[PDB]
Design an enzyme around this catalytic site. Structure first.
Site, PDB file in Angstrom:
ATOM      1  N   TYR A  46      -3.851  -5.272  18.789  1.00 45.49           N
ATOM      2  CA  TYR A  46      -3.991  -4.795  17.413  1.00 45.49           C
ATOM      3  C   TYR A  46      -5.309  -4.051  17.216  1.00 45.49           C
ATOM      4  CZ  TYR A  46      -3.503  -4.746  12.308  1.00 45.49           C
ATOM      5  OH  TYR A  46      -3.353  -4.352  10.995  1.00 45.49           O
ATOM      6  N   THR A 101      -0.873  -9.463  -3.579  1.00 46.25           N
ATOM      7  CA  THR A 101       0.543  -9.107  -3.516  1.00 46.25           C
ATOM      8  C   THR A 101       1.305  -9.742  -4.672  1.00 46.25           C
ATOM      9  OG1 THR A 101       0.746 -10.854  -1.825  1.00 46.25           O
ATOM     10  CG2 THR A 101       0.835  -8.562  -1.063  1.00 46.25           C
ATOM     11  N   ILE A 107      -5.764  -7.282   0.222  1.00 46.57           N
ATOM     12  CA  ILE A 107      -5.150  -6.847  -1.034  1.00 46.57           C
ATOM     13  C   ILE A 107      -4.219  -7.930  -1.577  1.00 46.57           C
ATOM     14  CG2 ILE A 107      -3.200  -5.329  -1.736  1.00 46.57           C
ATOM     15  CD1 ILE A 107      -6.368  -4.155   0.106  1.00 46.57           C
ATOM     16  N   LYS A 129      -5.510   0.104  16.778  1.00 48.74           N
ATOM     17  CA  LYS A 129      -6.042   0.657  15.536  1.00 48.74           C
ATOM     18  C   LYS A 129      -7.323   1.449  15.794  1.00 48.74           C
ATOM     19  CE  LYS A 129      -2.874  -0.878  12.496  1.00 48.74           C
ATOM     20  NZ  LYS A 129      -2.112   0.089  11.641  1.00 48.74           N
ATOM     21  N   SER A 139      -6.775   0.099  10.169  1.00 48.78           N
ATOM     22  CA  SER A 139      -7.095  -1.292   9.922  1.00 48.78           C
ATOM     23  C   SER A 139      -8.575  -1.479  10.174  1.00 48.78           C
ATOM     24  CB  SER A 139      -6.285  -2.244  10.811  1.00 48.78           C
ATOM     25  OG  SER A 139      -6.843  -3.556  10.797  1.00 48.78           O
ATOM     26  N   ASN A 199       1.712   5.503   7.011  1.00 48.55           N
ATOM     27  CA  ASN A 199       1.395   4.141   6.610  1.00 48.55           C
ATOM     28  C   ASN A 199       2.187   3.114   7.392  1.00 48.55           C
ATOM     29  OD1 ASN A 199       0.432   1.909   4.695  1.00 48.55           O
ATOM     30  ND2 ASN A 199       2.620   1.982   4.163  1.00 48.55           N
ATOM     31  N   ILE A 203       0.832  -1.208   0.000  1.00 53.07           N
ATOM     32  CA  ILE A 203       0.000   0.000   0.000  1.00 53.07           C
ATOM     33  C   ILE A 203       0.867   1.258   0.000  1.00 53.07           C
ATOM     34  CG2 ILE A 203      -1.564   1.360   1.466  1.00 53.07           C
ATOM     35  CD1 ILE A 203      -2.886  -1.363   2.251  1.00 53.07           C
ATOM     36  N   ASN A 244     -13.809  -3.563  14.179  1.00 54.56           N
ATOM     37  CA  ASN A 244     -14.376  -4.882  14.403  1.00 54.56           C
ATOM     38  C   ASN A 244     -14.048  -5.364  15.812  1.00 54.56           C
ATOM     39  OD1 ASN A 244     -15.633  -5.199  11.882  1.00 54.56           O
ATOM     40  ND2 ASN A 244     -13.759  -5.995  10.936  1.00 54.56           N
TER      41      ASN A 244
END
Lengths: 236, 240
Positions: free
Chosen positions: A155, A190, A188, A159, A142, A91, A19, A147
């Site tokens: 994590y 790769t 995404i 976020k 994220s 980022n 990204i 969520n």
């Protein structure tokens, strides 16, 4: 067209790959001079050189975003080379699933890496942004930030703090002419069909297109938002 | 009634005054043995004496919740005094409005005090709660966790992290028999009133006992199938 970055100077962190690299290359094609940073000096330099061989303006340097002297070096390199700072893309970041009983240093590291680092870089960039007449800050967050799942204590919570920092500091820096937004990216390249309404994996270019919009004059009155780019999906 | 805490042992932090003191008192009357902690050992001891003098069981201890040695000592003192731990009320916290350009030591401290401390105390309590057959963790958060405002970079972001931590770790410790919830209190009093009241549909300021009643519900068998919730207690208001 307001969808360009003409005469912008953009710092893009964690940009050796994925990204971050796609944002750096996209911003340069849109007219920005780009300061590419990565934890690995060679990764940042590789991206800056590829931008230059494509006709853009860019420099690359090492930056551990958790290291205050590295943060200051990036600011100084942007000003020394390009004369101003108008865009900051935070980022760099990291982490993932961890057990509830993880060592306390793992929990605290998630907040230093994902949150303290980009707050400080934002503090450092903001006065230069103001003197240049305004700017845009973009935080790559994220989907875990909104969520709720197992093994997400550090994590997910760090976020979520990034998302909420985005919404609050929009109030602090708006008066300096600075917008602050965040993107939460889906998966995404790769299972995807049932989770992803549009029925395909995302591309890094999809994230970079949304990043370009949010950092461009076309979004000059958008601040404090978290935009999920996930093909319509709500879970990872 | 399912609204009792019979044979419970509750740790309540930052409980010399205000919300924490009312929770400790209410939990004691509901049947819990209470470990009252506060930064000031004298204030914690005064609350525990009042509980004992009204017929409950309690001890008071000094605890700086950001110090790992104090955290471990509180957990051990609860087991040494009452034999088990079944309820943890993470009420200790602090902070407030700060300018965007604060020193980074202020930004990091909001997380050390509002977040790292209660996560660590939850880690330390959870295995004892499971051995005891189950338990409840209750985090006292702030409406700043869901609101957005100027001067909220450290306080709002750290309290949002408490809310999301609450929701996430509910998944981790649910299988151990532990529920995790939070309360976000509004204007609790412990012409400005007028401003607050014109933002409060129910037309009065909140009382520490309103928070304590909600805390008792969420830590009682009446809520044994409630976890991962953030309950805002605000008189209907949504603003700071």
């Amino acid at each position: 067209s307001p969808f360009h970055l003409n005469d912008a100077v953009a710092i893009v962190t964690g940009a050796a790959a994925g990204i971050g690299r796609a944002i750096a290359g996209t911003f340069a094609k849109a007219g920005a001079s780009v300061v590419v940073t990565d934890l690995k000096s060679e990764g940042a330099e590789a991206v800056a050189a590829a931008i230059r061989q494509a006709g853009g303006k860019a420099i690359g340097l090492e930056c551990n975003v958790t290291d205050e002297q590295h943060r200051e070096a990036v600011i100084k390199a942007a000003l020394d080379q390009f004369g101003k700072i108008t865009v900051l893309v935070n980022n760099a970041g990291g982490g993932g699933p961890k057990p509830f009983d993880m060592p306390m240093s793992d929990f605290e590291w998630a907040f230093k890496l994902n949150l303290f680092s980009l707050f400080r870089l934002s503090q450092l960039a903001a006065p230069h942004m103001q003197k240049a007449g305004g700017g845009a800050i973009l935080n790559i967050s994220s989907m875990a930030g909104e969520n709720t799942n197992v093994r997400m204590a550090s994590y997910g919570s760090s976020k979520a703090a990034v998302n909420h920092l985005t919404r609050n500091i929009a109030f602090d820096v708006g008066p300096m002419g600075i917008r602050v937004n965040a993107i939460a990216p889906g998966a995404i390249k790769t299972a995807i069909l049932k989770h992803t309404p549009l029925g395909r994996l995302g591309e890094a270019q999809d994230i970079a297109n949304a990043a370009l919009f949010l950092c461009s004059p076309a979004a000059a009155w958008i601040s404090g938002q978290v935009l999920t780019v996930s093909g319509g999906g709500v879970q990872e």
